[PDB]
Structures are given as C-alpha cells and as structure tokens.
Subunit: 251 residues, 4 copies
C-alpha cells in the first residue's frame, strides 16, 4: 500500500515541489492550501492524472486562534479520510512579512499569523499527527538557515522560525519512542518572493557562495525526500541546511 | 537623575533578586507582578525604606490576548510616570509547565500563557520600550534557558517560547542597535528549583551540575544581569550568557 | 565513466561501510588504511571481485608531522594514478582515546589533532589543488556530541571542533570551484570493539530513537546522500545521525 | 595577598589591555611575549611603578613543537616563581594570517596557527591545573568563528578547537573549582598592517556604533569572567561584538 503525506501550503513554490516529489516517490498527498485554491486544484488534477485517486486538497487557515487546534486535527483527519493512513507531515506553510519594532493589520493579528503559521500550527499538527498513529513515520519542518542572522525588522517571523527549531527538537525527543522522526530542512535563499524586483533578487543571489544563485524548489524538496526516506531512519532532531553556504558568509 | 528599570515577574525568586541588585546599583525600579501582590508590595516597601520613592509596583497578566499590547505599553508607561525615564527592561516573567504532545487548561490557553509570557510579551515590551526612546546606557535583558537545545521531556510549548526569545534577543539587538539600545540574554541552567518540586528531584538536578553540584543562587543570575546593563558591557549586544555551572555541557 | 572516491580509515567499521556503499553506488575507491593491511586488502579483493579494477589500497599514518603534507598529497595522487580522477574525499580516519588534563603529550597532540583535523585539512588542500556533469565533494566524519564532550577527551574534542571549522571554511573557499564540503555527525554508532556489553548498553539506553546505536551502514547512508546529485546545493552542512542523543539532557 | 595572572601575548593590543585591567583590579601579572620584548618590558616597568614587584615578563614561542609542552610548563612555573601562586590564565596570544587551500611551509603554518590558537592553550591549561579562592581561565575566542574569513582555514580551525577546549576543560576542571570561559571579539583593534580603507569597511559593518571594540571593552569582559560576579559561570563564551555576528551577508 502506498504511504500518505500531508504538505501544508502546497499549492505553489516550495510546498508544490515537495508534494510533487513525494508523489513521484510513490506517496499519496494531501495538498493543504489557504487562499490559493485554483493552484491547489490544478496541482491535484495533475497528480491524479498520473495516478488515480492519489491527491486531494484541503483548505485551512493556520493563523493562531482558539479553533486552530480543531483545524489542524481536521487536516490530519483529511489524510486518513482520503487515504486511510498518514505517514508523513511536512510543515511548509508560512506567513512572511516585516513587523518593525519602531513605528493594516493589528499587532495581535501579526502575532497570530506569523507565530501561528510558523510555530503554533506546526505544533498542533504534530500533536494531531502523533495522536492518530515496517512503518516509516516522520515530520519535516521547513526552517530557515538564516535564523541566527535575521533580516532587519522581521522579529515576529524570526521568533516563529526559532520556535520551530525548538519544536523540531522537542518533538524529536518526545515522539522517538513512537518511532516518529522529526527533522528540519533550512533553506537560505530559494525561490525569492514574487513581489521582489529582479535587482533585489540578484543582490541575494550574488551572496551565495555555491553558484551565486538561489536554490531551486526541487533542491529543497530533495532534502525533504531524503529525510522521509529509509536512508534517514536513524536521523531525528536534525536540521539540514540547504543554503549553498549562504549562512557561512560574514557581513 | 538615577536610571530606571522595569523587571517583569519581580515579586519572587530570580526576578526579585534582579530587582534588588538593580536597586542596590542605584536604579529606580518597577516591580511587575501578576498574582503576587503582597510580595511585590513587600519588596517595594523594603527598597523604598532604603531610598524613598525609588520603587513602584505594576500589575499585569502577560498571557497573550487582545489586550496584551495595551498591557505591555502600560508597564513601560508606569516606569516613565514614576521616574520620568526607562533605561533598562528585564524580561523575567515566565509561565512554565509541561504540554505533552500525546494524550484543566485547553491547549490554546497553554499556547497563550507559555508563548505569551516567554516570547510575545517580551516582544511587545521591547517595542514599547524602544518607541518611548524612538528619539545614556539603554538595554534589555531577556531571561533565557541554557538548556534550550536539550529540552525537558514534554515541555514543547515552553521550549518553543524560550527559543522564540533567543530569536527576539538577536533580532532586537540588530534592529535597535542604531538607537543605542543593547539587547542581551542571561541563560540559567538550574537556579532556584520550583517550589513544588520534591526534595529528591531537586537533589537529582543538583548532582548533575559540574561546578559545585548545586543550583545557582538567584543572586548569581542577577550578577550577570548587572554586568550586561553596566558600562562594562557597552559593546555587548545580541549575546546570551549562560550561568549554568557547566550543566549544558553534560551529555546524557 | 565511473567517479572515484578516497575514504580514510576504510578497512573497518564505519569507513569500511562507507567504502562499500560508495562502491555499490558506482564509485571506484581508494581504501586508505594505517595498521589494518589485511582488512584493507580483503575489502579491496571483495570489491574487485564485484567489479574488476575498481578498488585499490593506500597506506599512510595520518599523525601530524613534517611529512604529513606529503603523505596526504600521495593519498590523493593515488586516486588519480588508479582512476584518473578524484571526485569524493571522505575524512573518516580518527585516533580516539582520553587525554586527561590532570605516549608523550606531544605524541597525543600529533595523533588526535593530526588524524581528526590536520590530515583532513591537508587532504582537502591536495584534493582541491588537483581540481584547480561533475559532482565534487568532501564529507568529514564529525561528532554529534562535540558540544557535550566526554570527560577527559579534550584533545579528541578539540580535533572534532577543528573539523567543524574546516568543514565550514573549506565549504566557503571551495564553493567557487564547485566543490561542496559537508559533515556527517554520528552520536553513538559502532561501539569500540573491546567495550563490555554492559557499557555499550549504558549508551544505547540513552538514545531516544530505538535505544540502540547506529549501524555503520546508517552512517554511510548520510554520506551517500551528501555526495549525491540530490545534495547539489548543500555545502557547509553537518548532518547529525544520532537518534536524538544530542538532544538528551543530563 | 594578591592573586596572580598569566596573560599570553600581553605586550601589545588586547593582551596589553587585559594585563593592565587585571593589574588595576589588584592582580600581579606575568606578561608573556614572543617577539615584542621592548614593549613587554615597558609594560612591566609601568605596572611595577604603580605597585612594586607586581609584574614580570616571560618570553616564549607558542608554535606547536615537541618542546611546546615544556615552554607552557615554564610559563606557569614563571608565575609561581615570581608570585608563589597562579590564579588566572588568559589565553590571548594568537598567530593570524591566511592559509589558502588552493595555491613559510604548510607544516610551519599548521604549527603556528594551531599551536598558538589551540595547542598552547591546552598545554597551558594542563600545566595551570596540575600546579594548583577564585581560579579561572579565559580563552580569547572569535565571535565570527562560524562566519569565517576567506582563506583563513587553519586560523579558524584553531579557534574552533579553542571552543572545544573551553568546554572540555570547563567540564573536567569543575571538580577542582577552576572555571573555564571565553571572550569572543568580533572586530576590535584592526591589524596594524590593514589599510585604512579596509579598516573602515569593517567598522561600517558593526551594528552597534559602526566602530570596532576598544581593547579595554574586550578586557572588561575578561574582568567580569575572572571576578566573583561570575562564580557560577563556566563553559560560557561571551561575544563582545557589537552585533556583528548577527549580520547576514
Ligand atoms: N523561499 C525562500 O527562499 C525560503 C527561505 C527560507 C525558508 N523558507 C521556508 O520554506 C517554506 C516555503 O517557502 P516559500 O517561499 O515557498 O513559502 P511562501 O510561498 O511564502 O508561503 C507558502 C504558503 O504558505 C501559505 N500560508 C501563508 N499564510 C497562511 C495562513 N494564514 N494559513 C495557511 N497557510 C498559509 C500560503 O498558502 P496559500 O498560497 O494557499 O494562501 C503560501 O502559498 C516556508 O516555511 C519558508 O519560511 C523559504
Ligand atoms: N529557576 C530556574 O532554574 C530557571 C532555569 C532556566 C531559566 N529560568 C528563567 O529565569 C526566569 C526566572 O525564573 P524563576 O524560576 O524565578 O521564574 P518563576 O518563579 O517560574 O516565575 C517568575 C514569575 O513569572 C510570573 N508569571 C508567570 N506567569 C505569568 C503571567 N501569566 N503573567 C505575568 N507574569 C507571569 C509570576 O509572577 P506572579 O508570582 O506575580 O504571578 C512568577 O512569580 C524565567 O524566565 C525562567 O524561565 C529559570
Ligand atoms: N563509532 C562511533 O560511535 C562514532 C561516534 C562519533 C563519531 N564517530 C566518527 O566516525 C568516524 C568513524 O568511526 P569509527 O568508530 O569507525 O572509527 P575507528 O574505528 O575508531 O577508527 C577508524 C580508523 O582510523 C584509523 N586511524 C586511527 N589512527 C590513525 C592514524 N594515526 N593514521 C591513520 N589512520 C588512523 C584506523 O585505521 P587502521 O585500522 O588501518 O589502523 C581505524 O581503523 C571517526 O571519525 C569517528 O570519530 C564515530
Ligand atoms: N583584534 C581583533 O579584532 C580580534 C578579533 C577576534 C578575535 N581576536 C582574538 O583576541 C586575541 C587578541 O587579539 P589581538 O588582535 O590583540 O592579537 P594580535 O595582536 O594579532 O596577537 C597578539 C600577540 O600574539 C603573539 N603571538 C603571535 N604568534 C605567537 C607565537 N608564535 N608565539 C607566541 N605568541 C605569539 C604576539 O606576541 P609578540 O608581539 O610578543 O610577538 C602578538 O602580539 C587573539 O586571540 C585574537 O584571535 C581578536
Ligand atoms: N514564507 C517565506 N517565504 C519567503 O519567500 C521567504 C524567504 C525569501 C528570502 C527573503 C529574505 C528577505 C526578504 C526581505 O528583505 N524582505 C523585505 C524587502 C523586500 C524587497 O526589497 O522587495 C520585505 O520588506 O519584504 C525577502 C525575501 C525567506 N523566508 C521566507 N519565508
Ligand atoms: N519560569 C521557569 N521557572 C522555573 O522554575 C524553571 C526551571 C527550573 C528547572 C526545572 C527543570 C525541569 C523540571 C521538570 O519538571 N522536569 C520534569 C521531568 C522532565 C525533564 O526534566 O526532562 C519533571 O516532571 O520533573 C522542572 C524545573 C527551568 N526553567 C524554568 N522557567
Ligand atoms: N574514532 C572514534 N572511534 C569511536 O569508537 C568513537 C566513539 C564511540 C563512542 C564512545 C564514547 C565514549 C567512550 C568512552 O567513554 N571511552 C572510555 C571508556 C571506555 C569503556 O568504558 O570501555 C575510554 O577511556 O575509552 C567510548 C566510546 C565516539 N567517537 C569516536 N571516534
Ligand atoms: N590574532 C588575531 N589578530 C587579529 O588582528 C584578528 C582579527 C581582526 C579582524 C580581521 C578581519 C579580517 C581580516 C582579513 O585579513 N580579511 C581578508 C579578507 C577576507 C575576509 O575578510 O573574508 C583581507 O585580506 O582583508 C583581518 C583582520 C580577527 N581575529 C584576529 N586574531
């Protein structure tokens, strides 16, 4: 029987690349999305055309709130409803925008979105994943190789990604007796934001020692596929940088 | 004019010792508390007996909520009202309890309390501190955890909150450096053990500590805070000083 | 045509498993050894039985000395003379024993810092100087417990910390040549051969994931990943393969 | 009775400021030097004019060699000979120059860079510990050890090894009451041979004040770590870098 995976924020960009690579490896996939319905459905169509009834979409807001635990439970439930099992959880979805400390969304909403998507929803999904469980069960968190060299005015995003390191490690420890491995993949610069001008993209690209270019989405996905594979069966609590050396570069 | 400091969770234990040492160094102090009003006021009475009108109290819940930004602005405002300045912020207050991943409070309440006290309230307090200096030896000290990367079993939300606080310490150091505000951390290993912890369990922890087989006094933690806010640390920002007796170096 | 790899300390244990897995992946191998000639030769004969002319051995002491640069250049040269190319270097060989603060101390320095750090550096130098479709990389065998050191192992621990520095420094400097430099950090894998089972069990019981040590093959699996086409943007990274051991407090 | 300290590489720059501030704090000092004899003697003269018989010089090469253990033992011995005790060791001396991977012999470069930055600190730590209050060791680390400068591999290896020594020795020497810590500058006094434009480039990188640390600011962290206000601190490395290490590329 084929294994099944949940990928959050999987309609586009790195999450799509991860869903596609898992599918190509033989997984059935739940493509979670928030606003990108058309893209999520187009991806699911493509994957089901390759192999019937191996892709479903699942919509949810992962902003923090008192119903977020129920929403996260429902995402995991959606994998069991479609496929009867849930082997892999990939926490990819992420809000990302600056929140300057010195002076439109309220700061409460910014906290809820940035901390919710990058940390609290991963935690709740991890709880629900574990509660529902030869086998090769694992979680992969999308971290940030630059977490200790943060971008200016991104405090809440950075706090969220630091919390996600903590979750990765805490959950690795606590879920190891259940055979559930918990790891991270930490991009440096991969696909730059769609809104970024080409000159700003090239400023980042020129900083990367290995090739002066950003990681492709597929390169990020390659590290996720390794960590979910049998070739990583003793690996838990590890965060693999996929950054071309960027984090090693001084100012 | 004497400088002024805010210390969160200052009625007892490490926060109390930090407030006392700041006051002995010459600071005026805001003693923040949540439930410990009697002890906050007794501390203020002791400090004001030493120097009149140099200590005030301030009550607030630091759980995340719709009112937390306002609550944190009013803590910083209380320092300006009492003393006309706010030179130092010490983010000490902290909720601490296990949150197992597998199975009275709901998980969302636990998120609010553990992430609010350890991370979001420090962030909001940091914002309000800086904004009130938006136009001297100004600094922030965050109480971290030397064991952040060897966490206790079933403490995921606490640990996430302390990891977030490392990120805030570093992010705020970078962003606030142009304003001359330094942002640093002090990371205890084991200091004063929880009052509800059994004597046997306290001794198990003490026996793990390489340096002296004992926990840090609250005063030893406070000594590192005093260093970081002093003129002897004026080039130090974004640094987290472990005060742990070697505990974090000990393998399983 | 087949890529070629150098594996130091490849006659036994984790090095041997790495050499086997690289050979199974299609590499020609140089099996470096110091004292274990019979084991090195038996491995070579096994590999060449699988595919003729795909394995050679190379003897060298990797203790620090005045001759170590020449010894390291000769190891790399042996790969070129055998196979015409050198695509992968795996720095595995390692002296390991306690050196309490309270053999002469200069010999202990030479052996522990030489094998764990200075020979990796010199091999890296020589590897790169010969490279002054391709997928060139270096993998250093690190230690997941490098920041939670074992008592009285200061020189070993210094050597492994230096190896982290080498990994990162060489990743930065060699990136323009397309040479990636990464690490694999075991926690506990194969325990020392003479260690009593009761002592091995003290370690095993500490490992969150399965209460067991890693096989040599599981360590080799991470090396195979890092040298593969699936790791082409990964440089300067150290992958723990430790079952969560480094996360466990005292 | 006044405690005594050994400071390696103490004739000039950061080591000099450390020796001065320890002396001002009440320590007797051994001013170790390699080539800077005139400066070392000058410092000892200055400190002894303030308090007689409180400073001596001690010459040694700290390059790795088969005699380095003997040399390190003799530095510690020189503190006992002068002052009858040795309370503090500051491992400051350091060779620093690039060693490109793609192209002094390489063996000499290994010896100098790994010797001064790592092996000599280890042997001095051994000798300090064996010869034994508030005893401690402070190692001069590098806040940029994980964001290394191009072509500085051997230097960087030495500093990484020094982190390991700091931690290992903290663990092993704790039962003896000897604390072992580090101070990690980012940019402090820039090299004398660095050109002005390059110095200004480094300064402009520093978030906190766009200036390098003074030698005295680095010494201030050393003073803290040797003091009674650090009595529970061991195995800690304090960055004194103005935020430099937090700045991305
Ligand atoms: N791109 C990089 O260079 C880079 C660098 C470092 C780390 N990373 C990490 O790698 C991961 C993927 O990066 P990326 O650039 O592909 O991400 P992205 O495009 O910025 O965001 C991925 C998805 O997150 C979803 N999302 C955002 N807010 C949400 C919310 N409130 N509820 C639910 N889902 C929400 C969005 O789904 P919808 O579109 O359906 O609304 C979005 O498509 C992220 O965790 C990121 O932090 C990326
Ligand atoms: N003790 C240790 O060994 C240790 C180890 C590692 C790190 N640390 C860190 O060092 C700091 C001090 O430790 P500690 O043991 O002294 O702390 P603690 O006694 O556990 O807590 C300090 C104070 O936090 C306040 N607090 C808790 N929840 C709050 C809420 N919802 N709103 C506002 N304030 C709240 C309480 O104030 P009221 O009493 O007024 O309600 C409490 O007295 C903490 O940040 C802790 O994480 C301590
Ligand atoms: N085993 C573990 O649990 C563990 C844990 C953490 C890290 N690691 C690392 O993983 C790697 C492999 O571990 P392992 O246990 O397989 O290693 P090992 O058996 O201790 O040693 C591997 C080989 O190193 C060679 N070696 C030792 N001293 C040498 C010298 N002076 N010159 C040249 N070669 C020398 C020996 O070759 P000959 O036999 O031919 O003389 C030996 O067989 C090492 O780097 C180790 O530090 C292992
Ligand atoms: N300056 C910075 O910005 C900076 C940045 C990061 C870290 N640090 C660290 O802080 C420390 C002090 O830095 P610094 O700039 O003051 O150092 P420095 O001037 O580069 O060197 C200090 C002294 O080291 C001695 N030394 C060099 N090679 C030696 C050898 N073979 N044997 C014995 N002693 C030798 C020299 O003594 P003689 O003059 O007597 O020959 C020299 O004066 C060093 O550990 C350095 O790595 C400094
Ligand atoms: N979820 C998620 N999505 C991403 O795209 C992403 C990245 C991409 C890299 C990146 C880093 C900094 C800025 C940056 O400096 N942004 C500034 C300036 C933008 C500009 O100049 O266009 C901003 O204000 O956004 C913009 C992009 C990192 N982490 C991420 N996480
Ligand atoms: N705010 C705050 N207050 C504190 O008192 C405190 C401490 C004290 C140290 C401490 C450590 C473990 C446990 C503990 O409960 N351990 C678990 C066992 C799990 C484990 O230790 O891995 C227990 O049930 O004993 C309880 C207390 C750390 N961080 C803190 N932050
Ligand atoms: N190269 C290399 N080879 C290895 O085998 C290895 C290991 C194996 C793990 C390990 C850790 C500590 C001790 C330990 O405590 N050893 C003590 C006691 C041994 C015993 O009790 O039998 C020692 O004195 O050797 C022995 C073994 C780590 N790093 C290594 N690097
Ligand atoms: N002992 C010791 N003495 C020092 O003076 C010192 C320093 C000072 C800072 C420093 C930084 C870079 C270069 C430098 O040379 N940079 C190269 C460019 C490479 C790069 O910066 O990545 C150059 O040629 O400038 C030279 C000096 C750091 N560590 C030190 N240790």
């Amino acid at each position: 029987e084929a294994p099944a995976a949940v990928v959050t924020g999987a309609a586009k960009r790195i999450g799509r690349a991860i869903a596609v690579k898992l599918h190509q490896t033989g997984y059935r996939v739940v493509i979670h999305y928030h606003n990108s319905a058309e893209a999520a459905v187009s991806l699911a169509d493509e994957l089901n055309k390759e192999r019937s009834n191996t892709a479903v979409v699942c919509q949810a807001d992962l902003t923090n709130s008192n119903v977020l635990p129920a929403s996260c439970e429902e995402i995991i439930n959606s994998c069991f409803r479609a496929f009867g099992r849930c082997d892999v959880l990939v926490n990819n979805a992420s809000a990302f925008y600056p929140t300057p400390l010195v002076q439109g969304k309220t700061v409460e909403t910014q906290v809820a979105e940035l901390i919710g998507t990058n940390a609290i929803a991963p935690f709740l999904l991890t709880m629900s994943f574990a509660q529902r469980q030869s086998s090769n069960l694992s979680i992969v968190n999308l971290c940030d190789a630059m977490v200790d060299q943060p971008c200016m005015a991104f405090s809440l995003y950075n706090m969220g990604k630091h919390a996600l390191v903590g979750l990765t490690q805490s959950a690795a420890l606590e879920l190891a007796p259940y055979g559930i491995r918990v790891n991270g993949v930490a991009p440096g610069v991969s696909l730059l934001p769609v809104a970024m001008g080409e000159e700003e993209k090239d400023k980042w690209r020129r900083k990367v020692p290995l090739g002066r270019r950003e990681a492709s989405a597929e390169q990020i996905a390659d590290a996720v596929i390794f960590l979910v594979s049998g070739s990583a069966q003793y690996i838990t609590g590890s965060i693999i940088k996929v950054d071309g050396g960027l984090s090693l570069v001084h100012a």
